[PDB]
């Protein structure tokens, strides 16, 4: 259980999507007001208490 | 705590059984956001709606977004389907203008200045252009213009855009200014492909006879992350 | 894999 920001999700998504062994993959980018990425994901996607 | 309303616009830009994954991505995103507490009335769904009962679908009436995933189609509202998945309706929805909608549910993002908005698009793309299952296609300049308009209306506090398509970086790079309170990420840079995942012959593979990918890597990356 |  922990807080996740937009920035943290971007990093996780970037990592999973990146090429490894120089096969397939793509390079996740970010644009606009990157300062917003400090926001908790819950502000946009809510919280599934699970 | 946040006292504003959370809205989402979910857009699959393609049609056809071979494009199963884009509508599966969007249905999964719908279920995730509902589980997070976003209300159905605030989530606007664009999907051609030719997948769940496509004759090529090995499991009639369902859509899955991972090899052992649960159905994500049940419960998804049919806001804009078939030929109602078009750029004019998309823009009317984003701008919160019911009077500019043509066909479909009429649900729009009639948001207030303290609200948050999340937009997720998944499909096909090329430099400067995103697919739609109708003419016209969704061009980068037009999309950025409608985001600028929305900012001019002032009807959100901040907006997040997740974008899945080939050469998707091209849609925002040098076009999306700072100062709109918009944060966007893209599956790829402006010059490379983005990839499907859960594909026949790859690990992990879809169930037998699907012969189509169940999702897209950037898309399931964020949705599966949000889930855990 | 299929591309987008």
Residue numbers in the entry:
A (entry chain E): 284 to 333
B (entry chain A): 54 to 281
C (entry chain C): 2 to 5
Relevant lines from the article:
Arabidopsis thaliana encodes four legumain forms, two vegetative-type (AtLEGα and γ), one seed-type (AtLEGβ), and a separate grouped (AtLEGδ). The vegetative-type legumains, like AtLEGγ, are involved in plant-programmed cell death. Legumains are synthesized as inactive precursors, or zymogens, with a tripartite domain organization. It comprises an N-terminal asparaginyl endopeptidase domain (AEP),2 an intermediate activation peptide that blocks access to the active site and thus confers enzymatic latency to the zymogen, and a C-terminal legumain stabilization and activity modulation (LSAM) domain, which renders legumain stable at neutral pH and restricts substrate access to the active site.
For a detailed understanding of how fully activated A. thaliana legumain γ (AtLEGγ) recognizes a substrate, we solved the crystal structure of the AtLEGγ peptidase (AEP) in complex with the covalent peptidic CMK-based inhibitor Ac-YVAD-CMK to 1.5-Å resolution. The peptidase (AEP) exhibited the characteristic six-stranded central β-sheet (β1–β6), which was surrounded by five major and five minor α-helices. When we analyzed the AtLEGγ structure in complex with the Ac-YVAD-CMK ligand we found the specificity loops (c341 and c381) and the edge strand (βIV) highly ordered, contrasting the zymogenic structure, displayed in relative B-factors, which indicate the local flexibility. In the Ac-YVAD-CMK substrate analogue, there were two major hydrogen bonds between the carbonyl oxygen of Ser247 and amide nitrogen of Gly249 to P1 amide nitrogen and P2 carbonyl oxygen, respectively. The P2 carbonyl oxygen was further anchored by the side chain of Arg74. By contrast, the activation peptide in the two-chain structure was out of register and shifted for 2.5 Å to the N-terminal direction. The oxyanion hole was formed by the amide nitrogens of Cys219 and Gly178 as well as of imidazole ring of His177 (Nδ1). The protonated AspP1 carboxylate group was coordinated by Asp269 and Glu217 at the bottom, Ser247 on the upper side (“north”) and Arg74 and His75 on the lower side (“south”) of the S1 pocket. The P2 Ala interacted hydrophobically with Trp248. The P3 Val was constrained by the Cys252–Cys266 disulfide bridge and the guanidium group of Arg74.
